[PDB]
Amino acid sequence: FRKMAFPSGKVEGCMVQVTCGTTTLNGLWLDDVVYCPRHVICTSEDMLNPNYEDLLIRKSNHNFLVQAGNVQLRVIGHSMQNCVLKLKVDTANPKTPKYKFVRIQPGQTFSVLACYNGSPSGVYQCAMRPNFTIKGSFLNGSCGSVGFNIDYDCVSFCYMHHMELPTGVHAGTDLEGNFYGPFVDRQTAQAAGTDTTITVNVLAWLYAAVINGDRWFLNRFTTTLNDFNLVAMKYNYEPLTQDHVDILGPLSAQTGIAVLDMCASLKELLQNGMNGRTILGSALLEDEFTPFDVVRQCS
Numbered sequence: 001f002r003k004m005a006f007p008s009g010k011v012e013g014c015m016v017q018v019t020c021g022t023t024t025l026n027g028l029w030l031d032d033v034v035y036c037p038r039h040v041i042c043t044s045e046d047m048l049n050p051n052y053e054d055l056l057i058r059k060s061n062h063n064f065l066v067q068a069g070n071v072q073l074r075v076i077g078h079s080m081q082n083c084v085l086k087l088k089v090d091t092a093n094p095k096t097p098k099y100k101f102v103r104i105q106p107g108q109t110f111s112v113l114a115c116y117n118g119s120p121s122g123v124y125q126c127a128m129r130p131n132f133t134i135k136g137s138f139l140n141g142s143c144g145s146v147g148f149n150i151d152y153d154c155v156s157f158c159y160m161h162h163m164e165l166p167t168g169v170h171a172g173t174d175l176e177g178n179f180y181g182p183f184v185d186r187q188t189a190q191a192a193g194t195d196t197t198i199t200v201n202v203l204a205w206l207y208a209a210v211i212n213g214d215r216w217f218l219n220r221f222t223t224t225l226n227d228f229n230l231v232a233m234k235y236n237y238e239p240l241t242q243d244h245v246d247i248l249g250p251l252s253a254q255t256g257i258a259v260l261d262m263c264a265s266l267k268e269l270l271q272n273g274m275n276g277r278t279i280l281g282s283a284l285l286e287d288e289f290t291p292f293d294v295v296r297q298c299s
């Protein structure tokens with residue numbers, strides 16, 4: 001059972017290179033617009049305390065070098081929407097897939113196409129942490145790389161990487177420019193806040209374990225919603241709601257294990273630990289699979 005990412009072909013054809021002054025980072029070319037973080041207009045000194053409205057006025061259309069492989073694009077319009085730049089260009093992307101812009105919720109997963117100077121380099125799956133950060137691989141020059149999900153033929157763009165926090169974690173915005181969490185595109189100290197474990201995801205992962213043979217953790221006990229939630233706060237687990245119990249419905253039915261019985265296995269898991277053994281080959285509880293991810297990787 002593997003963390004597995006969406007096929008990235010439809011996003012690769014959207015990845016361009018955007019250079020303004022000395023700063024160069026990645027952009028997203030959909031239709032006749034290129035989307036990129038607004039701090040492409042920042043020098044390394046500007047990042048300490050930028051006035052973006054002021055800094056953008058120093059710039060005109062010809063100051064922006066948008067490159068899609070070997071082709072330059074003529075920039076014929078520029079606009080700042082929150083923390084993203086919108087570079088109106090003359091040529092519409094012939095490879096523009098069917099796409100939406102969505103703002104996802106904490107605990108939901110997505111794929112990330114890591115790019116460096118407009119060229120894709122890797123793809124990986126991750127989750128939006130409850131504190132609105134993501135833990136990933138964003139080396140120098142990965143700014144502008146996007147996160148997405150793919151339904152059928154539609155690419156739901158949900159994430160654009162802007163900053164690596166001083167604590168090593170990453171933060172960014174939706175495609176409208178609004179940061180997830182309380183983060184600002186400024187090189188200052190920013191608190192991420194207490195992270196928690198996505199409890200609905202861990203339960204979904206345990207359901208994947210039962211379906212794939214691993215069942216040692218299945219317990220005789222059961223428990224109540226309130227009793228389990230009391231054990232959740234202690235171990236920094238998201239509180240389990242009835243919505244979360246409903247979403248785990250199809251999984252509970254295919255394995256014939258009630259959600260509350262699975263919560264009791266998790267309870268003894270939280271209170272006793274792995275105690276040496278593994279689940280699906282992992283020595284710790286995995287919370288980066290949503291119930292939708294598990295069902296997609298089963299039947």
Ligand SMILES: [Se]
Pocket residue numbers: 025037039143162163
């Ligand atoms: Se950046």
